[PDB]
Amino acid sequence: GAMIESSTTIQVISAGLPRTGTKSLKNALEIIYHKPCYHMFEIIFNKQSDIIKWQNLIHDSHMITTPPPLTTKTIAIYDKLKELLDGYIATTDLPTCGFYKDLMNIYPNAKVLLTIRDKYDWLHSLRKVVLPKSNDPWKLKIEEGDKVLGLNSDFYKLTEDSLKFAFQKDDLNFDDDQVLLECYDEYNRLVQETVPSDRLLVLRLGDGWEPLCKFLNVEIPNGIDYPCVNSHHQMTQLTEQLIKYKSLDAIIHMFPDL
Numbered sequence: 001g002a003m004i005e006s007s008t009t010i011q012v013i014s015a016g017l018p019r020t021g022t023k024s025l026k027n028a029l030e031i032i033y034h035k036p037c038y039h040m041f042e043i044i045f046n047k048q049s050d051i052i053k054w055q056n057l058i059h060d061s062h063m064i065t066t067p068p069p070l071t072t073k074t075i076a077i078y079d080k081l082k083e084l085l086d087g088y089i090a091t092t093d094l095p096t097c098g099f100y101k102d103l104m105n106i107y108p109n110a111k112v113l114l115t116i117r118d119k120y121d122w123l124h125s126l127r128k129v130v131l132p133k134s135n136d137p138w139k140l141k142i143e144e145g146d147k148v149l150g151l152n153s154d155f156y157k158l159t160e161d162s163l164k165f166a167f168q169k170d171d172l173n174f175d176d177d178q179v180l181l182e183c184y185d186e187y188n189r190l191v192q193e194t195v196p197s198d199r200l201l202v203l204r205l206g207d208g209w210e211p212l213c214k215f216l217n218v219e220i221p222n223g224i225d226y227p228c229v230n231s232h233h234q235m236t237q238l239t240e241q242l243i244k245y246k247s248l249d250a251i252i253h254m255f256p257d258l
């Protein structure tokens, strides 16, 4: 296909929850658009200063009225969200995914994705990487590796509060598997009820390039396989290597996705 000059603005909003292929999708969208895609890893590696800003936004988010019409309070919140996303061509992952409705309003020419997978595979992945149960010994290892990266209690608070926001819960028993499974199913159902079908592509792990590229009117990247990264097995190795070497820079050459 011909090469065309793409605008550096949000063109793709992925509502998919963490551990549904968001990092592979981030990589895929950066391969297509050659500009950055938001993801929690963007906060960890490039924008830790953004943590307080997302926390502030979530704290105020209850004041949004879904437009149209646009209220004064909503405009003020939307401006802060636009600022956070300046320079990016897409959003994935926490903390953005719960804002998909608001991002659709801010970026009316953006298209919407939803990544989904088997609910029990999702929970298992979530418990291995993001939210281990309180009494799980692996939680202490995760926390020890995270400190190497400069991640503290505010990072965990952002994960919790952005998951609460996505699930529209005032509080959440994070150790309750049944609650998380029910929230997962309700969240994915509500996305599909909310986004006009013409504007939504539902992706399942394994779908690869073709449905995505068709939806985005781009050629399939030539000779590049669809990304397959961020497995919980690989995250466990990362945590263990951070613990062992006590720096990211000492080991990053061993993790080509970082």
Ligand SMILES: O=[N+]([O-])c1cc(N[C@H]2CCN(Cc3ccc(C(F)(F)F)cc3)C2)ccc1CO
Binding pocket: 018, 019, 022, 039, 040, 041, 044, 093, 094, 129, 130, 131, 142, 143, 145, 146, 149, 159, 235, 238, 239, 258
């Ligand atoms: O899915 N994730 O990765 C995810 C992990 C968390 N929370 C914390 C809890 C445990 N800690 C493990 C870990 C260490 C280093 C990296 C690195 F690769 F970014 F360096 C990634 C994960 C991260 C929160 C949200 C997401 C959504 O993306």
Ligand SMILES: Nc1ncnc2c1ncn2[C@@H]1O[C@H](COP(=O)(O)O)[C@@H](OP(=O)(O)O)[C@H]1O
Binding pocket: 017, 018, 019, 020, 021, 022, 023, 024, 121, 125, 205, 206, 226, 227, 228, 229, 230, 231, 232, 233
């Ligand atoms: N192309 C692909 N095909 C199959 N699974 C994929 C994939 N890309 C990512 N995944 C899976 O998606 C999950 C990561 O999601 P995220 O990037 O949102 O955190 C991992 O699940 P597992 O933890 O079950 O391995 C990973 O293995």
